[PDB]
């Protein structure tokens, strides 16, 4: 309190400014000169009463000015309605907050006045008066509801609370202990006077005024007024219907990038049109960039805004592309002749050094044309297997594909004829995939050309894999997932000759970079000249002339002459071979010849012949993913010094300015990231400059601002690289602390191949770009409409969570910000469903609603978080012929514990493939074929899976080479997003198991009988669950709400507010229209009263027969009031029995209780009441309900019963329970037990209720 009061004092001291000069201000002097005011001298208490009664009269006049007869203002200013309001009466009772603020201020004022009126009547002493004024200014917020009306008033309360604290303890030392009274009200008085100083003119202004796309449209209106008002009347009557027609046409021609030109137009009005188009174009461009920068930062917006903004930036990028293609066609080729001849002869020397044989044309029958054509058609129908409803242009495509299936040889003849003859092609459409961060194109190709291009894609990759065209450092490969690429890269870093020995000044350099504008800077003529060396010239002309085609977007057509078309089938070859030409420019021919080795004995990826040719050059590790290069250097002292000297020769640095601008990893701490010593920074600048000098800028360009250099030396303890979405920090064992060996996840222990001891540690993290892409996917899931069912949203969430975790398996546990983001997005997804249930926010909501599987009627949600199942939610019940039995059965298991790590899976894969090799070697020599008996011990173990060995399509899938880069490039061809782009199930198998998750989910939620208590199953009269089925992926929202109604409509979910339905006794907590629409349909046509009267008539027919066995002389059915069936405050007797002579009665006991001792209080009249119940999950125990209703209705002066001896029978319809409590005469209890059993088994009204429940839930058996 001291620190906060000192905070307010420092703020008032800092925000102080001198007041502005003005005329001196006298309100009462101007009031005095008016003849309507008089002056007198009065006591303070009398004028204090006059002010508050005048304020009461003012508020009364303001209430009855609007003819509001139903609102009563108390004399302590409490405003209350006299009755229950209606819709229009709530509309006519909408005052401003200034009204209720003035109400509470006058309430405070009347408290302050009446505190002294209590004093001057002789009731209290002034010692008791000063305490009372002290309580008021301290507890304004507790005595008044003024805090709800102004929120900034919360500043004024706590300050007056803090001044409440200090004085008290400064008062409470010495002989003073505790108790009421200080009497120092001035400190609380000044603050509320200073508050009234600011609140006064706002309330005066309110009483004063009580008692007494558009900007562009206005700009266009001003421009049209400036045009039309200058022209005279005979031209005003003509150009009002002349300009407006072509005024939109000029804007449309600008939007379609059409040059606007019309004859017969004067030049100043043409310049005015050009100024109009230019101003609207600047407004539209700034609006489009502003709307993109709003939604980039995560601000929510309507979906139509995103749909329009995508088209706006699509048109702007089309105008930019038509500009840059015209710039290429005007400026000529950007490449010189000498660079082209240099890279041409470089490719010639590399193909002569490897003795490569060129890929020929398939002459008549390659005897594998059918397999490649079937694989191409399966890749074309791979995208169309998602949905079963397609458009007409796609139905034509599937018809052409099925005609290619039915007649394959004619299709092959058409493909070969289009290869040998066709050079002109149809126009390719363009669309954009709406990622929130990065715009990405998707191309649309004619299907007859697409079949030919897909067969060309298959044939070219199948020939390129056979002829060994690509060296193994070109990545990705078919056999390696990218985390296995990261692991093999770390093992290649570890297994070098003395890579961590830096005792003599050695250095490690880890460069990572991206070829900037790799796809857009490929000259097609240069592509053809480099392509004619490896394939047929007709095939090269087919691949070259395909890129020179017109791209269309709906109004805009432009030819392509610079850059390749990335959406083609065979374009995945064009990416990979040309980058090998980059391998000849960065790595050099000698080092690439050392890495690739002899053609007669090629080396492995990150392997060499010997150690001498491995360490004879500093350039000793190299890798390239599709556009990102990753290079690793080992330097000595003298080579690094000479390289720094060669850098500082042309580029000196007198002020050491190369430190500012160095890219560094901010996700790691400062002791973890790169330390920027001057030698290491100069060495990194020298390395990047030496790599940049080897590439001609007209061919390709690397940039420092998108690159990264990590230097390991004596002054840097650790090495860093970003690769394949992974942040990796390598740290030596010998440069750190002792043996300790604490096991953590996200840590790869690195060991040597030869010595097999631990040498270094690799630390894994998820980079920022993957987390931002995941948050983009979460925001795309949060763009679901209100009519969308919950199960589709949960399925999209589960798809995104599997696509995150099954790629980032080990690295999620290491990073904590992603673990927080997952939980935050999970709570947002759950809140999206909780708002869709009811608009009011519930206090609690069970997780068992979400995480119930779809087979049991739930959503089937996956879990990444710490969710606890509380007690008294795992208890269930059952009813049988001896009575009611209760039973009692924790955390929800998560996803990351049910997925294998990477390193143990790699070790297991190596072991099972070595064992498979040894068993295959023993099987060949013994003339034995391997079966499932020899491979049942290593089932679903290994990358790739062993399941691919026993597939029917071995000879078909064995001919599919180069599938991973095509699977990655599927995103440029299909408009949907592609999770699992890095894998394919037919080749690598299934890499996870999710049935244990469902098993532990069913086990952890208390079992099936524990789950089905929430699900309204016992109202459906199915004895088992296993014989049932759902009516058919998704569940509707009404059926979901009606299914989970026992656990939603509870007292502890929507606290306080409860209502009762009219014709039933159903209590609704809060209000849910989606459940009310089902409760009206099920309980229609007075079904509650029909069930009640049916049970009454059936029990009266029970008491009608067997008359002499109970000594009954008269059974009587009482005149039941039609509102008795649902009124629950009081009740009445339903069936009355008259004893013949006399009956003995017992003490009130339960229906299942057999310990009956009867008393001597013999009565003649006996009464039976029937009560129905609609319960929920926390309150459905019918025995204590019957006991509580009997003890309520027999011990009050509101219910009427003719006899003090009777029984109350309670039936729960939500779970179909029945019990009884009360007095019993001899022979009545087993009779009524068997009678209620026969009623609950054979009441036709209950059968109508249960069949309406089964019709509403759509659940059959």
């Amino acid at each position: 309190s001291y620190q906060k009061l000192l905070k307010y004092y420092v703020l008032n001291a800092l925000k102080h400014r001198p007041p502005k000069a003005q005329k001196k201000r006298y309100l009462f002097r101007s009031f005095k000169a008016t003849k309507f005011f008089q002056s007198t001298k009065l006591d303070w208490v009398e004028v204090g009463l006059q002010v508050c009664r005048q304020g009461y009269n003012m508020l009364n006049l303001l209430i009855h000015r609007k003819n509001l007869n139903y609102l009563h203002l108390d004399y302590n200013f409490n405003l209350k309605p006299v009755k229950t309001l209606t819709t229009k009466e709530r509309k006519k009772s909408r005052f401003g907050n200034a009204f209720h603020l003035c109400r509470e201020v006058l309430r405070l004022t009347k408290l302050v006045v009446d505190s002294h009126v209590q004093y001057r009547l002789g009731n209290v002493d002034a010692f008791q008066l000063a305490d009372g004024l002290q309580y008021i200014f301290a507890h304004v917020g507790q005595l008044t509801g003024m805090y709800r009306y102004k929120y900034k008033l919360m500043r004024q309360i706590r300050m007056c609370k803090d001044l409440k604290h200090l004085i008290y303890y400064r008062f409470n030392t010495g002989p003073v202990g505790k108790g009421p009274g200080c009497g120092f009200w001035a400190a609380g008085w000044r603050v509320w006077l200073f508050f009234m100083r600011g609140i006064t003119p706002l309330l005066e202004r309110w009483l004063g005024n009580l008692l007494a796309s558009h900007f562009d449209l206005e700009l266009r209106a001003a421009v049209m007024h400036d045009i039309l008002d200058m022209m005279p009347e005979g031209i005003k009557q003509n150009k009002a219907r002349t300009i407006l027609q072509h005024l939109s046409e000029a804007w449309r021609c600008w939007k379609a990038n059409i040059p606007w030109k019309v004859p017969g137009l004067p030049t100043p009005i043409e310049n005015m049109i050009l100024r109009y188009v230019k101003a609207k174009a600047d407004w539209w461009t700034n609006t489009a960039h502003y709307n993109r920068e709003r939604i980039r930062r995560g601000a929510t917006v309507d979906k139509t805004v995103c749909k329009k903004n995508l088209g706006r930036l699509t048109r702007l990028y089309l105008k930019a592309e038509q500009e840059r293609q015209h710039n290429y066609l005007k400026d000529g080729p950007y490449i010189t002749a000498e660079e082209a001849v240099a890279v041409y002869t470089t490719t010639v020397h590399w193909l002569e050094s490897r003795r490569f044989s060129p890929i020929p044309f398939p002459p008549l029958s390659y005897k594998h044309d059918t397999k490649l054509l079937i694989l191409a058609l399966e890749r074309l129908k791979e995208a169309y297997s998602v949905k079963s409803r397609l458009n007409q242009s796609q139905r034509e495509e599937l018809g052409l594909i099925e005609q290619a299936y039915d007649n394959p040889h004619e299709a092959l003849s058409r493909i070969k004829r289009h290869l040998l003859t066709q050079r002109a092609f149809k126009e390719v459409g363009i669309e954009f995939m709406d990622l929130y961060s990065h715009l990405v194109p998707v191309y649309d190709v004619e299907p007859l050309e697409k079949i030919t291009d897909a067969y060309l894609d298959q044939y070219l990759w199948y020939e390129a894999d056979k002829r060994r065209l690509f060296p193994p450092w070109i990545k990705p490969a078919d056999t390696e997932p990218p985390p296995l690429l990261v692991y093999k890269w770390c093992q290649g870093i570890n297994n070098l000759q003395d890579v961590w020995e830096t005792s003599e000044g050695e250095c490690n350099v880890m460069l990572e970079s991206r070829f900037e504008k790799m796809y857009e800077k490929i000259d097609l003529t240069l592509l053809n000249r480099l392509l004619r060396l490896i394939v047929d010239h007709n095939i090269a002309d087919y691949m070259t002339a395909k890129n020179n085609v017109v791209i269309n977007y709906k109004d805009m057509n432009h030819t392509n002459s610079y850059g390749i078309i990335r959406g083609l089938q065979f374009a995945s070859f064009i990416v990979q071979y040309y980058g090998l030409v980059m391998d000849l420019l960065v790595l050099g021919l000698h080092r690439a010849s050392e890495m690739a080795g002899p053609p007669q004995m090629p080396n492995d990826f990150l392997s060499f012949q010997d150690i001498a040719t491995e360490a004879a050059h500093p350039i000793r590790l190299f890798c390239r993913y599709i556009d990102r290069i990753h290079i690793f250097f080992r330097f000595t002292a003298d080579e690094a010094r000479d390289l720094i000297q060669r850098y500082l020769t042309e580029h000196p640095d007198p002020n050491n300015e190369n430190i500012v601008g160095y890219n560094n990893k901010k996700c790691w701490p400062r002791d973890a990231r790169m330390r920027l010593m001057k030698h290491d920074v100069n060495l990194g600048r020298a390395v990047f400059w030496d790599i940049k000098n080897r590439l001609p800028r007209s061919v390709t360009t690397v940039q420092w601002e998108n690159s990264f250099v990590s230097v390991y030396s004596k002054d840097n303890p650790n090495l860093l690289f970003n690769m394949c979405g992974f942040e990796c920090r390598i740290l030596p064992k010998c440069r750190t602390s002792y043996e300790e060996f604490t096991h953590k996840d996200g840590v790869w222990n690195l060991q040597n191949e030869v010595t097999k001891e631990r040498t270094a540690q690799c630390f894994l993290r998820v980079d920022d770009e993957s987390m931002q892409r995941f948050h983009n996917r979460v925001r795309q899931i949060l763009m679901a409409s209100g009519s969308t069912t919950f199960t589709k949203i949960v399925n999209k969430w589960n798809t995104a969570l599997i696509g995150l975790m099954t790629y980032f398996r080990e690295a999620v546990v290491n990073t904590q910000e992603l673990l927080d983001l997952l939980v935050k997005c999970e709570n947002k997804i759950q809140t999206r469903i909780k708002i869709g249930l009811n608009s009011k926010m519930p206090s609690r909501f069970p997780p068992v609603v979400f995480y119930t599987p779809k087979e049991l009627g739930g959503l089937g949600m996956l879990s990444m978080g710490h969710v606890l199942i509380p007690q008294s939610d795992l208890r269930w019940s059952k009813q049988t012929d001896v009575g009611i039995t209760h039973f009692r059965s924790q955390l929800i298991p998560n996803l990351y514990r049910y997925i294998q790590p990477w390193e143990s899976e790699f070790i297991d894969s190596q072991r099972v493939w070595a064992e498979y090799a040894l068993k295959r070697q023993e099987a060949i020599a013994q003339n034995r074929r391997l079966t499932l008996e020899d491979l049942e011990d290593s089932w679903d173990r290994g990358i790739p899976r062993i399941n691919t060995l026993f597939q029917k399509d071995r000879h078909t899938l064995a001919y599919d080479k180069g599938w991973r880069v095509r699977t990655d490039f599927k995103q440029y061809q299909v408009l949907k997003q592609n999770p699992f782009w890095w894998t394919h199930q037919r080749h690598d198998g299934k890499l996870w198991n999710l049935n244990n998750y469902r098993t532990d989910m069913i086990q952890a939620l208390g079992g099936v009988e524990g789950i089905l208590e929430h699900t309204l199953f016992k109202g459906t009269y199915f004895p088992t669950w296993e014989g049932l089925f759902w009516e058919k992926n998704q569940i509707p929202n009404r059926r979901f709400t009606l299914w989970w109604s026992p656990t939603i409509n509870r007292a502890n979910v929507y606290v306080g507010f409860q209502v009762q339905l009219d014709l039933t006794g159903i209590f609704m907590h809060g209000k849910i229209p989606t459940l009310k629409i089902s409760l009206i349909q099920i309980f229609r046509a007075h079904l509650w009263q029909k069930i009640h009267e049916s049970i009454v008539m059936d029990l009266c027919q029970v008491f009608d027969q067997e008359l002499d066995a109970l000594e009954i002389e008269t059974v009587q059915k009482e005149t039941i009031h039609p509102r008795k069936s649902y009124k629950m405050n009081s009740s009445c007797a339903d069936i009355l029995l008259f004893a013949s002579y006399k009956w003995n009665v017992s003490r009130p006991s339960l229906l299942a209780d057999s310990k009956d001792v009867m008393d001597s209080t013999t009565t003649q009249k006996y009464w039976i009441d029937i009560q129905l119940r609609w319960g929920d999950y926390d309150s459905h125990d019918i025995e204590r309900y019957a006991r509580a209703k009997f003890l309520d209705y027999t011990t009050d002066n509101m219910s009427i019963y003719p006899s003090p001896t009777g029984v109350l029978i309670a039936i729960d319809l939500a779970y179909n329970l029945h019990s009884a409590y009360g007095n019993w005469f001899p022979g009545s209890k087993p009779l009524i037990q068997q009678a209620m059993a026969k009623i609950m088994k054979a009441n036709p009204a209950l059968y109508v209720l249960r069949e309406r429940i089964r019709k509403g839930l759509q659940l059959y058996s």
């Binding site: 996840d745 673990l819 759950q830 609690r844 978080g865 710490h866 514990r897 790590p901 491979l935 679903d940």
Partner: peptide, 28 residues
């Protein structure tokens, strides 16, 4: 326990990643 999914930061001490993960038997 008002819903409120909690963060997994610091709430794993004895729980590994490979634990409670099972594989399937070969079908038929």
């Amino acid at each position: 326990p008002t819903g409120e999914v909690l963060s997994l930061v610091g709430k794993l001490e004895g729980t590994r990643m490979g634990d409670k993960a099972q594989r399937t038997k070969p079908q038929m």
